[PDB]
Design a protein around this ligand. Structure first.
Ligand code: CL7
Ligand code: CL7
Ligand code: CL7
Ligand code: CL7
Ligand code: CL7
Ligand code: CL7
Ligand code: CL7
Ligand SMILES: C=Cc1c(C)c2cc3nc(c4c5[nH]c(cc6nc(cc1[nH]2)C(C)=C6CC)c(C)c5C(=O)[C@@H]4C(=O)OC)[C@@H](CCC(=O)OC/C=C(\C)CCC[C@H](C)CCC[C@H](C)CCCC(C)C)[C@@H]3C
Ligand SMILES: CCCCCCCCCCCCCCCC(=O)OC[C@H](COP(=O)(O)OC[C@@H](O)CO)OC(=O)CCCCCCCCCCCCCCC
Ligand SMILES: CC1=C(C/C=C(\C)CCC[C@H](C)CCC[C@H](C)CCCC(C)C)C(=O)c2ccccc2C1=O
Ligand code: SF4
Ligand code: SF4
Lengths: 30, 67, 28, 35, 33, 685, 80, 132, 136, 29, 147
């Protein structure tokens, strides 16, 4: 779990930020 | 409170001239809620931005006015 | 005055009450 | 009339006050504190 | 010289004020020289 | 009528020169305007007299004229009262005075004025020119108001102002040059002492060449080339002025030419423009200020690249001061041009007159223009400033190989580099032929050295120069976007269809429609001035840093130049940290360390300018509201004490708050840069 | 939309109604004041909120007061 | 903190001094004058302590400030008594006779202050003071 | 059905956008004495044809700006403003009574007239959690 | 010095407030 | 070629740029507008074109450029961008009601954009096309380099 940074960071920033932005988009556009 | 001339201190809280002496210039009209028409020396803020002059005379309430 | 090269002429006011009260560093 | 008008009146007054203070400073040296 | 005279004669053609036509021809001569 | 509110005073000063407002008839207006133009010319004559007078009376002019390299021009002695004596500098040969940067001395030497008598004569000449120009105004207004017809006579006025002034002024000046200036400068170069040189009353390939480049002694252009140039222009302008129709059958009528020019795309073409131009002062002031500003900017570039006057090149202080002064005047004038184009569009625009002409067609596609400018500004924004950001990130991330630079990823300004090769190598026998050399060394040159100093050299162009050029393109387009938007939407928008009616200056049309603050054409000039400031600030910085890293310097033992900043432009100007560190931080060392020296005044003005600038944020960031509330509390405190003034004190107009915000922002920012430049170049250069 | 409320002290100068750029205001007959009129605001779905009305009103504590809320296409002043 | 005479730094500053006024002796005169005041040992720069230092020039300042304030107040009274409409050519245009009278009655404010304080002439009643 | 002749205009970009179709246009119809030239509020100069002229604009303020500033100046006070829905519902708005709102006419109620003057409006502290506004 | 067992347990614990934050957020909406 | 206004009250000027024949030909036959395409087809062509284009900036300009791995960057980057656009289409369509309106350039836009069905179809197209585009461009880059 030295690599956990290289997984957690893209997951949270890119994937989570993406999913968050998508969800907030649905939320404010529905 | 005389129509030709007077010294009324306005007690209307929402007024530019609250607590200022003013000279009435019109007879209190029958059936007019605010018929004093006191003329105050100082001008009001009235006017578009950078309008120098404003309003000198407003139809003040009789109750609000006081000799 | 400092620019004109006469720092003497500065209005240096000493903080007397700070001296009176004075962890505490020199109040000039 | 021109004399009465603020700009000229003030121009003269301050060109006097400024010159007066300049003259004072010219004559008396740097006075930081009352001697 | 002939060239300058030729230009003045042609300048009348251009016009078709006399001073103006001549002036133009003079400059054309200056260019040719 | 009466001064009831403090706003009256402000309004007085504001609309005092708004002849359009005060008057109703173009006649009375044009009379006022003509009279004023005289007044103004007198102000300029006073000022010119002042400059040549100070050069005569309080100057090291004669010493400088003797030995320019040694001496530093200083026609500005300061009275010692509060210890400001220190502002008087050791400029050499023991003269103590404020080192002037106007280049007045270079002007006079170029004019071939060597005699103190001559200089006093010039001073008094210009001063009587002032005394007559102000009276001429009085005469032409009070005594004898001119006639509307004369004004509308644009064809006459063109022919006149183009031969009488341009053609004849250039011939006149070439006389004054070849006869007085050119031989005097020849003698002074040969080494004839100022005293030795004869007074003026005492009294073709030799004096007219196409050498190009610079006089290697003086560092200026060969005054032979100057004479030949001015003569050329005299010739051209005499002809060109003959190509109009004044009070005869000979020439082109402007209205004929204009109405001729139509086309597929431009519908009815220029039909109606002569009418609006003649009837509308503002239209004229717009076109003029736009071209006048544009002229000052060409001045700036030309005077640095082809330093006309003798020894100017070597005088780095003047070369900078003049580029920067002219850039400022340029930007300010260009914006006033836009201003008066908007004032025209609001006041002096008739839909009657303009009907499917080029102006109407502009207004009719004004969304495509604003939209496209918007786009080109975003585009350029990103592909100029965003390239610096890119580089800040890459360089800070230690990925210099990923940067835009002469190294790594390279954006070579090839069009410009090409034009440069095409002007350096293409000396003779192309288009206009028989040019012995390049018009300037800027195109391509080995450094010409006058004394230790590099007079002028190849101003290179790399990635740094591509980038900063796109920064200029970006900021000029944004300034155009703001200005052209304020012009084309001064009449109306989708937001406020009756803007024409609301006026040119109005604070807003109130809080509705989401808010309409700053929707007026005036408000567009407000915002345009901040972008013109940002634009010209970066142009002046680009100049300062490029000059002092790549052009200016000192010749050491080896051929190499000792550039003022040692060529850090190429690598340091391609990041914002580059600019903060290697330009503002690195180069503010003179102005910040200037206290207790000759340049202390630049230090003080650096601080005071920072203060005026910050202070303007008070005006720009706040609204009339808060201030009138606070003002009335303060008035209550004067009322308690019976000090309350006759003129009720009113928080300044919304528009005035903005105008002083902007005034202080501009004064502060400009003076700040001015302090920094002067301290650095007076000290170092 | 913006609620436009006309208060007791309306001196029926007809200044507001001539100001309103979306003609929200109609000068209606009223026995309350010497003027014989008052200001009415039927068409407040067309109130942009410019407050040119308030700006034009000459009475101290102006009777015409516009209260901005629930911005719509017509309030927000959108062509689009 | 220590007399400037005593402080060795101040003597160093005195040796090399910048002359403000044209006269060569202005620098030396200034330092000689400044010798009286107390100055910090490291700095050797005259300091100001909150009577000669601050109180006396404070008094002079206050006298002049009171003078100019009083003169303005007096001229305001002259404005509201000269004409039915005070502002028009009363503030924008300055009546030199009224002003000079106001100035002459100015600088007498210290004696005048006692009378003004008596019966609260200066203060106007809260009731009168216009405040929304 | 709100029929007039469209003022001779070369076209602009200042006109109706998708909202014209999607939501609601407006239409100003006025009677012109002459074929005179007027500033188009969209930006430009159009020439009103002789007699009834119909103009489809994008908001009421655009219509009332043509009317109040330009037409009324030309002394043309015949203009009628119609909210046009997509279905073609043309609804007269501006002179709803047929008389300019400045002139007092009967059968027009006092709308949003408030008895109490500005001064006397209630403080919000008092009315907290009632859901009544000060002006209300 | 911190072992993988520990890093995992920390994550698994942190997952609990995650679920409960989702729950509380939902509630407060 | 002159500027004229179809329906002069609408804010749309016919110009040589929006109403010319050559232009109308090109625009109206691009896969957004081209008549007689399944929405899926519209998307597959738009996608392929963009994926293929997108490969280039990424492969050429990115951080690992020059290396062999740059081709893989190019393809994955372009595909990532296409996946993000695929998300954008889905969420757009989810919340979109609006239909492409007839314009000067395109008198009959169509329904493929303007119905939730259409956008889903287009997006499925766009995704497959885009990632295909990007892969094809990398394959061709490797091919041409080798050859
Ligand atoms: C023109 C610039 C100038 C100004 C504005 C100015 N003086 Mg001088 N000026 C004086 C006072 C003065 C006052 C009270 C004053 C008010 O503003 C000024 N000045 C102003 C006196 C000390 C003195 C003249 C007194 C005199 O007798 O009157 C003086 C001088 C003198 C000069 C000179 C050259 C000046 N000045 C100059 C000025 C003497 O040589 C000469 C020395
Ligand atoms: C323009 C810059 C400046 C400002 C703003 C300023 N002074 Mg001076 N100014 C004074 C104080 C002062 C105060 C309390 C004050 C602010 O309220 C100021 N100043 C303001 C007095 C001590 C003194 C009178 C004075 C001086 C003097 C100087 C000088 C040069 C100044 N000043 C300068 C300034 C003395 O020669 C001269 C001097 O050298 O004294 C040290
Ligand atoms: C007055 C306008 C003009 C004319 C009519 C003109 N020349 Mg010139 N002209 C030439 C020939 C010529 C011919 C054969 C010719 C017609 O007979 C002309 N010109 C005519 C070549 C010598 C040369 C090409 C040319 C020039 C030049 C110029 C210029 C400005 C001119 N001209 C000018 C003209 C070069 O720079 C350039 C110049 O530097 O000349 C001194
Ligand atoms: C800033 C760009 C600008 C320029 C360069 C410019 N104008 Mg205009 N300009 C005029 C003419 C004009 C001329 C002849 C002219 C010549 O070049 C210019 N302008 C130029 C008059 C027709 C007309 C009125 C002229 C009139 O208002 O001008 C009177 C002067 C004013 C108020 C004083 C304030 C000027 C600066 C604050 C002072 C700067 C001095 C110094 C740098 C810093 C201070 C030094 C120190 C004290 C610290 C005018 C308009 C106006 C505006 C505006 C915004 C402008 N302008 C703008 C400009 C109207 O509102 C206004 C108008 O209402 O629209 C019609
Ligand atoms: C600026 C961004 C923002 C922040 C930082 C923020 N809120 Mg809100 N905010 C709340 C409180 C709150 C708290 C206690 C809090 C932190 O102290 C914040 N917020 C913080 C609740 C009232 C409510 C709970 C939201 C709620 O549903 O949160 C869901 C919980 C989360 C994300 C899961 C976290 C774990 C991921 C595995 C909330 C709202 C809401 C929003 C929005 C947009 C916000 N917010 C905005 C924010 C709802 O609409 C939404 C709304 O509908 O409000 C009416
Ligand atoms: C976030 C901070 C940042 C900024 C502001 C920034 N970069 Mg960088 N940035 C780049 C440019 C760039 C530009 C032009 C730019 C301008 O704003 C910026 N950046 C800005 C490239 C050099 C590089 C490449 C990134 C990369 O390649 O991104 C993809 C680029 C693409 C998809 C856009 C290409 C745009 C089209 C060509 C437009 C053409 C339109 C056409 C005309 C229309 C008509 C078509 C038809 C009808 C005819 C990049 C980097 C990179 C990074 C990183 C981290 C950054 N950056 C960072 C930043 C790389 O690693 C990476 C690094 O490797 O650097 C080498
Ligand atoms: C928000 C509703 C939603 C859910 C619940 C969901 N997806 Mg998708 N989803 C995928 C996986 C997936 C998994 C494994 C999964 C559940 O385990 C889900 N999804 C679930 C990938 C195969 C595929 C591409 C990769 C994909 O987008 O992310 C990979 C999936 C992850 C790590 C598992 C987490 C589950 C998330 C809730 C899905 C996140 C989708 C989000 C909207 C976009 C985030 C940013 C994005 C640009 C990466 C995908 C699609 C995609 C979309 C969209 C709009 C969605 N989704 C939406 C959702 C693409 O267009 C997009 C599209 O390309 O496909 C048509
Ligand atoms: C640093 C100060 C500042 C910035 C950054 C700024 C930014 C800009 N101003 C613009 C305009 C204006 N500004 C105006 C008034 C002002 N603008 C001011 C100060 C600024 N204005 C001030 C102080 C004023 C008051 C006078 C006006 C009146 C206009 C315009 O009309 C003009 C405009 O809008 O034109 C369209 C835009 C220029 C066109 C453009 O888009 O370029 C591109 C964007 C740039 C250069 C900003 C930085 C972009 C960088 C490269 C970031 C890249 C993006 C990354 C991906 C970061 C995203 C991070 C997320 C992932 C979290 C741009 C948004
Ligand atoms: C150094 C860099 C430049 C710094 C200054 C730049 C300022 C630019 C700000 C924009 C102004 C453009 C022109 C607008 C001109 C204009 O009309 O502005 C309009 C502005 C406000 O007009 P309003 O619309 O608010 O007034 C309303 C009335 O017109 C009716 O409502 O007026 C003022 O700013 C009032 C103050 C005038 C000036 C007050 C100072 C008086 C002394 C000035 C002395 C100057 C000496 C100069 C000597 C050379
Ligand atoms: C500070 C500020 C004010 C207040 C500033 C004012 C009222 C400046 C006017 C007062 C100055 C001090 C003018 C000088 C007044 C007289 C000339 C007084 C005589 C001075 C003698 C002593 C010489 C505004 O009015 C304002 C309006 C809109 C946006 C921002 C602001 C803003 O920021
Ligand atoms: S609120 Fe004002 S403008 Fe409106 S009717 Fe009353 S007095 Fe007239
Ligand atoms: S806010 Fe403006 S549009 Fe709305 S009612 Fe008042 S004056 Fe009329």
């Amino acid at each position: 779990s030295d690599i956990l940074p290289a997984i957690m960071t893209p997951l949270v920033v890119l994937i989570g930020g993406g999913a968050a932005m998508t969800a907030f988009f649905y939320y404010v556009e529905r | 409170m005389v129509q030709r001339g007077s010294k009324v201190r306005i007690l209307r809280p929402e007024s530019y001239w609250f607590r200022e002496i003013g000279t009435v210039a019109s007879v209190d009209q029958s059936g007019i809620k605010y018929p004093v028409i006191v003329r105050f020396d100082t001008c009001n803020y009235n006017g578009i931005s950078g309008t120098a002059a404003g309003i000198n005379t407003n139809n003040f309430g009789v109750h609000e006015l006081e000799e | 005055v400092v620019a004109f090269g006469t720092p003497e002429k500065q209005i240096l006011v000493e903080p007397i009450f700070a001296q009176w009260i004075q962890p505490f560093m020199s109040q000039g | 009339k021109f004399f009465s008008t603020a700009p000229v009146i003030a121009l003269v007054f301050f060109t006097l006050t400024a010159g007066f203070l300049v003259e004072l400073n010219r004559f008396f040296p740097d006075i930081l504190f009352f001697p | 010289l002939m060239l300058f005279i030729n230009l003045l004669m042609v300048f009348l053609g251009r016009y078709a004020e006399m001073l103006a036509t001549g002036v133009f021809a003079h400059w054309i001569g200056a260019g040719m020289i | 009528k009466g001064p009831q509110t403090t706003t009256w005073i402000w309004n007085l000063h504001a609309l005092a020169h708004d002849f359009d407002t005060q008057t109703n008839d173009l006649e009375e207006i044009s009379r006022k305007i003509f009279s004023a133009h005289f007044g103004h010319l007198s102000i300029i004559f006073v000022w010119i007299s002042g400059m040549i007078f100070h050069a005569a009376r309080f100057s090291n002019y004669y010493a400088w004229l003797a030995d320019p390299l040694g001496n530093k021009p200083s026609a500005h002695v300061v009275w010692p009262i509060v210890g400001q004596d220190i502002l008087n500098a050791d400029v050499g040969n023991g003269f103590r005075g404020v080192q002037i940067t106007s280049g007045l001395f270079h002007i006079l030497r170029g004019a071939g004025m060597t005699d103190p008598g001559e200089l006093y004569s010039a001073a008094i000449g210009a001063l009587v020119a002032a005394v007559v120009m102000m009276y001429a105004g009085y005469y032409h207004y009070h005594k004898k108001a001119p006639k509307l017809e004369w004004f509308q006579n644009a064809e006459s006025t063109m022919t006149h102002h183009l031969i009488v002034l341009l053609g004849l002024g250039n011939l006149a000046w070439t006389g004054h040059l070849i006869h007085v200036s050119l031989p005097v400068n020849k003698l002074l170069d040969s080494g004839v002492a100022p005293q030795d040189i004869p007074i003026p009353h005492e009294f073709y390939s030799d004096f007219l060449t196409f050498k190009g480049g610079l006089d290697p002694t003086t560092g200026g252009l060969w005054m032979t080339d100057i004479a030949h140039h001015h003569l050329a222009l005299a010739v051209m302008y005499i002809i060109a002025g003959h190509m109009y129709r004044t009070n005869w059958g000979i020439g082109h009528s402007m209205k004929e030419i204009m109405e001729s020019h139509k086309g597929p795309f431009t519908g009815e073409g220029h039909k109606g423009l002569y009418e609006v131009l003649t009837t509308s002062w503002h239209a004229q002031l717009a076109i003029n200020l736009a071209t006048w500003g544009s002229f000052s900017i060409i001045v700036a570039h030309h005077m640095y690249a082809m330093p006309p006057y003798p020894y100017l090149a070597t005088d780095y202080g003047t070369q900078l001061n003049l580029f920067v002064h002219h850039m400022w005047i340029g930007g300010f004038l260009i914006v006033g041009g836009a201003a008066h184009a908007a004032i025209f569009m609001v006041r002096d625009y008739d839909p009657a007159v303009n009907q499917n002409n080029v102006l109407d067609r502009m207004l009719r596609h004004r969304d495509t223009i604003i939209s496209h400018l918007n786009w080109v500004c975003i585009f350029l924004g990103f592909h100029s400033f965003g390239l610096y950001i890119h580089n800040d990130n890459m360089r800070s991330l230690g990925r210099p190989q990923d940067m835009f630079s002469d190294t790594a990823i390279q954006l070579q300004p090839i069009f410009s580099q090409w034009v440069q090769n095409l002007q350096a190598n293409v000396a003779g026998t192309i288009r206009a032929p028989l040019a012995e050399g390049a018009s300037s060394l800027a195109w391509g040159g080995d450094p010409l050295f006058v004394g230790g100093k590099v007079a002028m050299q190849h101003v290179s162009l790399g990635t740094a120069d591509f980038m900063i050029h796109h920064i200029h393109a970006f900021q000029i387009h944004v300034t155009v976007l703001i200005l052209i938007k304020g012009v084309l939407y001064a009449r109306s928008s989708r937001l406020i269809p009756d803007k024409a009616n609301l006026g040119f200056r109005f604070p807003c049309d109130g809080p509705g429609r989401g808010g309409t603050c700053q929707s007026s054409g005036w408000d567009h000039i407000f915002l345009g001035l901040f972008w013109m400031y940002n634009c010209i600030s970066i142009v002046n910085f680009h100049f300062f840093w490029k000059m002092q890293s790549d052009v200016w310097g000192a010749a050491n033992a080896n051929g190499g130049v000792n550039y003022l900043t040692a060529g850090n432009w190429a690598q340091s100007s391609i990041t914002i940290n580059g600019w903060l560190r290697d330009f503002l931080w690195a180069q503010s060392v003179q102005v910040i360390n200037s206290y207790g020296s000759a340049l202390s005044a630049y230090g003080i003005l650096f601080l005071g300018a920072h203060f005026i600038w910050a202070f303007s944020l008070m005006f720009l960031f706040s609204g009339r509201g808060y201030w009138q509330e606070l003002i009335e509390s303060i008035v209550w405190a004067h009322s308690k004490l019976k000090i309350a003034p006759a003129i009720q004190p009113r928080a300044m107009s919304i528009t005035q708050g903005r105008a002083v915000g902007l005034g202080h922002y501009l004064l502060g920012g400009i003076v700040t840069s001015w302090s920094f430049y002067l301290a650095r170049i007076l000290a170092l250069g | 939309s913006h609620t436009v409320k006309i208060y007791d002290t309306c001196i029926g100068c007809t200044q507001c109604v001539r100001a309103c750029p979306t003609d929200v205001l109609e000068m209606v007959p009223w026995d309350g004041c010497k003027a014989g009129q008052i200001a009415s605001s039927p068409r407040t779905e067309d109130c942009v909120g410019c407050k040119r009305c308030e700006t034009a009103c000459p009475t101290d504590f102006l009777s015409i007061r516009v209260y901005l809320g629930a911005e719509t296409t017509r309030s927000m002043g959108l062509a689009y | 903190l220590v007399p400037c005479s005593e402080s060795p730094k101040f003597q160093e500053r005195a040796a090399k001094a910048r002359n403000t006024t044209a006269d060569p002796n202005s620098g030396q005169k200034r330092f000689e004058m400044y010798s009286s005041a107390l100055c910090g040992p490291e700095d050797g720069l005259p300091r100001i302590i909150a009577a000669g230092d601050f109180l006396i020039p404070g008094l002079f300042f206050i006298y002049i400030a009171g003078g100019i304030g009083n003169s303005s107040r007096n001229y305001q009274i002259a404005n509201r008594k000269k004409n039915a409409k005070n502002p028009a050519m009363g503030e924008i245009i300055i009546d030199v006779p009224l002003a000079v009278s106001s100035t002459i009655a100015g600088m007498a404010w210290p004696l005048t202050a006692f009378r003004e304080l008596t019966s609260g002439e200066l203060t106007v009643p809260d009731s009168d003071v216009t405040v929304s | 059905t709100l029929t007039g002749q469209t003022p001779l205009f070369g076209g602009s970009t200042g006109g109706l956008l998708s909202s014209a179709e999607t939501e609601e246009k407006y239409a100003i119809t006025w009677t012109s004495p002459k074929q005179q030239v007027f500033e188009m509020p969209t930006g430009g100069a159009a020439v009103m044809n002789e007699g009834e002229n119909l103009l489809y604009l994008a908001r009421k303020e655009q219509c009332l700006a043509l009317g109040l500033r330009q037409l009324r100046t030309k002394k043309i006070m015949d203009y009628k403003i119609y909210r046009v829905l997509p279905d073609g519902s043309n609804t007269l708005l501006h002179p709803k009574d047929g008389v300019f709102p400045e002139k007092s006419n009967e059968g027009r109620a006092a709308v949003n007239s408030v008895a109490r003057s500005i001064g006397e409006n209630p403080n919000p502290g008092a009315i907290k959690y009632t859901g009544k506004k000060a002006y209300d | 010095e911190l072992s993988d067992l520990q890093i995992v347990i920390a994550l698994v614990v942190a997952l609990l407030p995650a679920l409960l934050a989702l729950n509380l957020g939902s509630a407060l909406s | 070629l002159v500027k004229h206004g179809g329906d002069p009250l609408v804010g749309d000027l016919a110009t040589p740029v929006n109403s010319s024949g050559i232009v109308k030909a090109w625009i109206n036959n691009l896969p957004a507008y081209r008549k007689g395409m399944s929405a899926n087809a519209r998307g597959l062509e738009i996608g392929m074109a963009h994926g293929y284009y997108l490969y280039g900036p990424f492969a050429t300009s990115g951080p690992i450029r020059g290396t062999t791995m740059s081709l893989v960057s190019g393809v994955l980057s372009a595909s990532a961008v296409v996946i993000v656009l695929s998300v954008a289409i889905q969420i757009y369509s989810s919340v979109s009601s609006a239909k492409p309106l007839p314009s000067v350039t395109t008198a009959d836009p169509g329904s493929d954009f303007g119905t939730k069905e259409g956008w889903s179809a287009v997006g499925s197209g766009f995704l497959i096309g885009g990632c295909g585009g990007a892969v094809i461009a990398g394959v061709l880059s490797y091919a041409i380099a080798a050859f």
